[PDB]
């Protein structure tokens, strides 16, 4: 009960400190009131509490928002289309948190467009993955297959629209799956001749 | 920015999470619970007794 | 003024505050006295800030 | 005594019914359909539970 108490009293008073925040946040209604069930555990358990697994990662800003974010990523890549998670080794451990999440090219690119090469995305075989993330919304750092301890990235809406330049050829390889004629409908022919 | 700001002022704020279990209030209510406890305590050792 | 008007005498020790006086307080000026310092320790996070 | 050993693993929580647990899926690989089991490296050494 006294540790029932370290918990309820220590709630009575964040629901104060709190409540600005979501006056002032109201669409970060979920990590706010996980840090302050994180904080209740904390006080409860006396469990350590990590500074950097609990803190806000800015992935990109805005500054006008005129000319739109225009990301235009020529080597179409995993890891800088969706983002890396880049891991920190203490004694041999690898461990990862929020703040070793980092950008790729989509996560700079929402709102605005993000301009690929189709060979590109050919080439390196990640058309398949960025069909799934223009789909499904599911975009997520790669995890380099040696670190086991990873993180549950959840499905993140996708606001900004892609644009793929190439050679006709570069899209003989690709109209023939039909989720590409599903997602890709605009066809921006530039015509070879002039008059 | 804000948002960072404030979640860094909340993380130091586990300074005066820990004070507040030291607060008058938190004291009193501590002591009133031991002293609960120990009467049962104390009931359960007279019919021991 | 609140603890005058209840007739308890606050004794201040720092940070942590507390009522002397004949028996226990009031529920109401325990709430008082809470709110008061969990609003004074606000004051000394927005004091970090 | 580890405690890690020995908590339950919530896996999901129980539905009124209407709506039922609808999952889609679109991305079928085995890790997302059956479950994850992740590990810890302490010194070189891998560990589960």
């Given at each position: 009960a006294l540790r029932r108490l370290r918990r309820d009293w220590a709630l009575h008073y964040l629901?104060?400190?709190?409540?600005?925040?979501?006056?002032?946040?109201?669409?970060?209604?979920?990590?706010?009131?996980?840090?302050?069930?994180?904080?209740?555990?904390?006080?409860?358990?006396?469990?350590?509490?990590?500074?950097?697994?609990?803190?806000?990662?800015?992935?990109?800003?805005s500054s006008s928002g005129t000319p739109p974010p225009i990301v235009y990523e020529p080597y179409a890549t995993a890891p800088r289309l969706f983002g890396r998670l880049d891991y920190l080794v203490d004694r041999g451990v690898w461990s990862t948190n929020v703040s070793l999440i980092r950008p790729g090219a989509v996560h700079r690119a929402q709102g605005g467009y993000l301009?690929?090469?189709?060979?590109?995305?050919?080439?390196?075989?990640?058309?398949?993955?960025?069909?799934?993330?223009?789909?499904?919304?599911?975009?997520?750092?790669?995890?380099?297959?040696?670190?086991?301890?990873?993180?549950?990235?959840?499905?993140?809406?996708?606001?900004m629209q892609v644009i793929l330049?190439?050679?006709?050829?570069?899209?003989?390889?690709?109209?023939?799956?039909?989720?590409?004629?599903?997602?890709?409908?605009?066809r921006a022919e530039f015509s070879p001749t002039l008059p | 920015i804000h948002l960072a700001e404030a979640v860094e002022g909340l993380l130091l704020e586990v300074?005066?999470?820990?004070?507040?279990?030291?607060?008058?209030?938190?004291?009193?209510?501590?002591?009133?619970?031991?002293?609960?406890?120990?009467?049962?305590?104390?009931?359960?050792?007279?019919?021991?007794? | 003024r609140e603890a005058q008007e209840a007739g308890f005498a606050l004794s201040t020790n720092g940070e942590r505050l507390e009522l002397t006086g004949p028996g226990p307080v009031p529920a109401e000026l325990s709430a008082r006295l809470e709110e008061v310092t969990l609003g004074s320790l606000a004051a000394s996070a927005e004091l970090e800030v």
């Open positions: 629901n104060n400190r709190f409540e600005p925040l979501f006056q002032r946040f109201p669409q970060a209604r979920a990590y706010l009131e996980a840090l302050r069930a994180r904080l209740a555990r904390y006080a409860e358990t006396g469990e350590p509490l990590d500074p950097a697994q609990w803190r806000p990662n800015l992935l990109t800003s301009i690929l090469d189709a060979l590109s995305l050919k080439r390196e075989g990640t058309w398949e993955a960025f069909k799934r993330a223009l789909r499904n919304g599911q975009v997520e750092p790669v995890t380099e297959p040696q670190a086991p301890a990873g993180l549950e990235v959840e499905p993140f809406p996708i606001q330049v190439g050679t006709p050829e570069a899209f003989e390889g690709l109209e023939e799956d039909p989720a590409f004629s599903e997602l890709f409908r605009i | 300074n005066r999470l820990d004070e507040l279990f030291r607060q008058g209030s938190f004291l009193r209510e501590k002591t009133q619970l031991e002293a609960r406890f120990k009467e049962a305590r104390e009931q359960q050792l007279e019919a021991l007794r | -």
